[PDB]
Amino acid sequence: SNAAQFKEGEHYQVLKTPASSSPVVSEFFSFYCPHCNTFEPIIAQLKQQLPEGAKFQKNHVSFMGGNMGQAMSKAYATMIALEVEDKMVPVMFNRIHTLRKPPKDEQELRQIFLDEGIDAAKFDAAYNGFAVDSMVHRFDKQFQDSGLTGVPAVVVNNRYLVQGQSAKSLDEYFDLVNYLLTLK
16 A cells, blocks of 8 residues: 655645755744744744754744834844844743733833843844844745745745644644655
8 A cells, every 4th residue: 555645735835935955944933923922832842853954943024013023023033143042032922922011112122132131232233233134134035935924834945835724633743844844
């Protein structure tokens, strides 16, 4: 017998973007998105069970938060640049969704980092710097080129968009991502 396989059109969609050069799982998210917050424990599990060699990369989108969406994307890229994601990702989700005190402007956004002990000079150099600017350009262009319509969204190898609702269980969802990682 031959085993059943995941199906294009039911379980995933092939996007117009080029395939990646190595295996990668990308999650498009916003800190403003409650469901993205809810998805965090599942993302942690997903990462822990990925095949050796596969990368995982969050991409922040700028379309939630009104006039603070771009600033919040810069904040996420700053977390990457400063290598403080493990602390600052849950801090930022907590600030928005549990404390429910989202930053009204870039000054308040910066203060969220300083209040966790992030060095002010390092923050200022990163937030307004070239690496962060480059990363936010990439987040936005990837979202556009991929033709995505909302968050959260999980894309494997740059061109396989997971149809999240198609999986009947978490283990099946993981199986789907692991399968897509083998496709070019």
